Write a protein that binds this ligand. Structure first.
Ligand code: HEM
Ligand code: HEM
Ligand code: HEM
Ligand code: HEM
Ligand SMILES: [Fe+3]
Ligand SMILES: [Fe+3]
Ligand SMILES: [Fe+3]
Ligand SMILES: [Fe+3]
Ligand SMILES: [Fe+3]
Ligand SMILES: [Fe+3]
Ligand SMILES: [Fe+3]
Ligand SMILES: [Fe+3]
Ligand SMILES: [Fe+3]
Ligand SMILES: [Fe+3]
Ligand SMILES: [Fe+3]
Ligand SMILES: [Fe+3]
Ligand SMILES: [Fe+3]
Ligand SMILES: [Fe+3]
Ligand code: NA
Lengths: 159, 159, 159, 159, 159, 159, 159
């Protein structure tokens, strides 16, 4: 049984987004750890691994639909040079997901592929929470001031 | 609390298809077990028990909607005389499910019955997986050869 | 502390090779799994995860040398459409690694970066074993024959 | 305490055979493992270690009889390039053992050295079983076909 | 067994450096503890004990090479009066180590003393990580501000 | 994958030395045990088993390199008639290993085969240590006096 | 809180002696261990670690007194070439401690610094005991005879 060509292309575009985010988040976590923000880095690393899960799920869906998962293509990394830049770069990816997926889900259901729809609805919900988390860190950076904020991202003592 | 008569009719149609699948899968597994393919048989038998669970969830839904679950009607069994035929026979039932539930779900949602819809979406998801497994079994029969595939279905020694 | 720029170029090239390998091995694993070769897929999946460890190790080193780990660039995937093509495709990557690392190690040592050299020596040893595994599988295919080899790669019963 | 000179010679010849067998079987196990026949390899390896135990028992007896255990001399290895060859090679050693030890035991008892007699009687009993196993393996190859037989020697999946 | 005279000299110089580092780091840990930066103190102290382990490993190698471990000689301590100074002082030792050991290792290998080479390669790897940590600490001080940074070094409450 | 002819020859010469050592050490332990030096014999025996491990490692590396491990050829055994002679005879083998492997390693690295080099470097480190142990035993005999030294080799009471 | 200049100088002279002792004793244990006197070496080593403890205590008392602990200066090492010489060399250090600390304590108490006096009194009690031990070892050598005494220092068998 073959999936709908547009649904499949939508899934591959999402796949590319996940692969991009895996790399971007993973690199950020390494950088964060390298700067001594070890506590922050553990969180960002986990976000990276969650993206790997999404990526695998999508790959599973594509193969079931008899498509070809695209592992060759990658989007453009935005690698931040400060904590703030990193949060904002990560926000950018997440917002791009929502813009793609919101109308994509509607399309999936019009094409009577609810299983694909449901998988993307799951992703939307996960990205909304991450977007919320990030936007809250940026808020706290302003409420706290950048130094005091950063201090909450190191262990005691710093390592 | 009375359900939409069309939604109700759809649910009863799906229940008929579950009860048919239960009998078909169960019998196929007894045959497989009776032929010597005991390892395969256990798998088929479990598939039968999952159909039972689906049938019961459908029954619950119908009763909740004040409908009358149809336990009288059974569709036409396709009993396979070879492992290949049995896989093809089970495969044909699942495709009927998809063919019915795809527009079924869209309809449920238009009639503003999301709970019934979510039940059918769950079923579509499981059926797709089972279709994939069965289609994959048939491909494996071609790659391995009939005899070779069949030998992976018996225990050691054969019981 | 600043790393030798050629050493850093070498590490980044190898990084790209690891990332290419992660994707290629992961996809091959999902394809093998989707064909029914569930026993083989588990192994291949594990080979993919070692590549991820390697990539992190190289990343750590690059960061320590105050370099810029490249997560943007990816090599050409070689995707196989049979078990044989897959083994050959994965072999081609590994062989590339050796050819790059054999001179690289000598070079790292001429440049007095032994930590980087030892890292790459470790990689070489691993790749040598993976190559030996792959090449042995290809041999087995011939000794046992395609089908019979394939049968050793499915569970009982097949899943 | 001094041993009879012919008994000591008989014992030292048997030792050479053990030492020969140790090396032959161990290399075979290595080559079988290297080939992917890892299940067979473990058995062959175990056979090598039993040979080591024989060799040590013979050494003990020689030392007790105030003789000189010969660890310098070795027989000619027959290294097989196929599973069948390896079995026939191993068989050939085991037969030489019977041919030597049968008259040897009668001799030991004639010379009233029953302890050496009993040691040699145990080795004969052990070699007969090993020979029988090798013969069965050669037979199974004929009954199952070589490829099919080989497949019973790999693990699932082939490691 | 006699060691090469230059290798032995290289080894004894490294020993002096270890002995120097042991004392410097230990005093620093004591002064950090004494200042109330008790969380930092424990890490620094641990660093001192790793130095002790290095020193013992070097001594073992010298003794094995029939040389004379020099425990009389010591380098000039650089005792810091601020946390920043202490970090810079400690850094200065670690850099001298790299500067000595880099050419030293090539020399050991030229003289075909690989065991001494490997020991020195391990120390380099360890020193690079320590240097990186010190650099990160210096950086964190800049990013967090000195007071804020210091506060990440006291316990709650300050003991 | 095919190994360099000089590296393979180097590895095989070393394998010959390991096999030779295994025999010499094992027989020495048996003699020591038969003289009543049961405590010393246990250590000598364990040394033999370590040689067995090295021989397996070399064998594996040869097989990976697609060479033929030589199990046919054994070096000349020096079998000591006193503890001192045994000690000295074992020293002579070990010093031959160092003699070969020192330029051997350098050549391995010139030929860009680091995995092989690293195996031999490990072997050299172990041998340097066994030489230390043996030379110290010989020193102890001179210090304590042979009778007294021998007494430390027996159990209480002697067995 | 500021300590008396003579008390501080007293404490620092003693610290210098502890640091000197640590080195002399540790190196002696390493030599003893390398001569095969492994049992004796363990005790000598533990003595070194006890000196380390005294040095930390003195360091703490100095810091509390607001002085500068001297970790730059080490006394003259007497490194014995035989057990007897090592024993005698260690005695000489210990007797110097008593020589200093005896009037040292009295002066401490005249200056109304009992905490410091009590630390030194503890040190003296420990040293008197280590002197007893060492003098008894030297007596034992005369009684048993050096060879025999040495034999009690090795394990069975010697390692
Ligand atoms: C037709 C409507 C049926 C319904 C709604 C139903 C429901 C269930 C359910 C919920 C279970 C529990 C196990 C599981 O769900 O996996 C079960 C077990 C079982 N089913 Fe059915 N079933 C039906 C008919 C049948 C038929 C036609 C057979 C033919 C053999 C059958 C044979 C069995 C057996 C032997 C068990 C195990 C009993 C036990 O474990 O004590 N059932 N059934
Ligand atoms: C591209 C840079 C990547 C890095 C640096 C990386 C790193 C890692 C590491 C170190 C692990 C754990 C290894 C272990 O525990 O054995 C891991 C797990 C995993 N990887 Fe990746 N990986 C990368 C890309 C990918 C890609 C392209 C996929 C495609 C599916 C993927 C899928 C996964 C999954 C599903 C897990 C398991 C997650 C978990 O168990 O929590 N990764 N990754
Ligand atoms: C001559 C060529 C030989 C080879 C290639 C060889 C190989 C090996 C290897 C690789 C081991 C691994 C030990 C471990 O992993 O701890 C081993 C163990 C052992 N060796 Fe040998 N060895 C040889 C000769 C001998 C001889 C002459 C004896 C005489 C008794 C012997 C007796 C043993 C025994 C009893 C063990 C351990 C048994 C066990 O692990 O179950 N070996 N050997
Ligand atoms: C030179 C100035 C030194 C100072 C001030 C010093 C200080 C100390 C102190 C106070 C302890 C406490 C031990 C205990 O509480 O049981 C200790 C333990 C120890 N010392 Fe040192 N020591 C010095 C030199 C050395 C040297 C040259 C070595 C050579 C190996 C060494 C190796 C060790 C080790 C391995 C421990 C225990 C490790 C642990 O507790 O985790 N020390 N040292
Ligand atoms: Fe995602
Ligand atoms: Fe996310
Ligand atoms: Fe169903
Ligand atoms: Fe189903
Ligand atoms: Fe890799
Ligand atoms: Fe690999
Ligand atoms: Fe035998
Ligand atoms: Fe046998
Ligand atoms: Fe160090
Ligand atoms: Fe360090
Ligand atoms: Fe060896
Ligand atoms: Fe050795
Ligand atoms: Fe003291
Ligand atoms: Fe003392
Ligand atoms: Na089979």
């Amino acid at each position: 049984m073959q999936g709908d060509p547009d649904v499949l292309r939508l899934l591959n575009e999402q796949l590319t987004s996940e692969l991009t985010a895996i790399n971007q988040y993973f690199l950020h976590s390494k950088m964060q750890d390298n700067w001594g923000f070890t506590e922050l880095a553990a969180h960002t690393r986990a976000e990276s691994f969650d993206e790997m899960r999404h990526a695998e799920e999508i790959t599973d869906r594509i193969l079931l639909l008899d498509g070809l998962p695209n592992y060759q293509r990658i989007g453009s990394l935005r690698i931040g040079q400060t904590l703030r830049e990193q949060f904002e770069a990560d926000l950018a990816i997440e917002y791009d997901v929502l813009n793609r997926l919101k109308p994509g889900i509607v399309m999936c259901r019009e094409k009577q592929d609810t299983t694909s729809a449901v998988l993307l609805e799951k992703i939307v919900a996960d990205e909304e929470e991450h977007i919320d988390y990030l936007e809250t860190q940026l808020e706290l950076m302003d409420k706290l001031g950048e130094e005091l904020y950063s201090a909450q991202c190191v262990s005691r003592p710093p390592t």
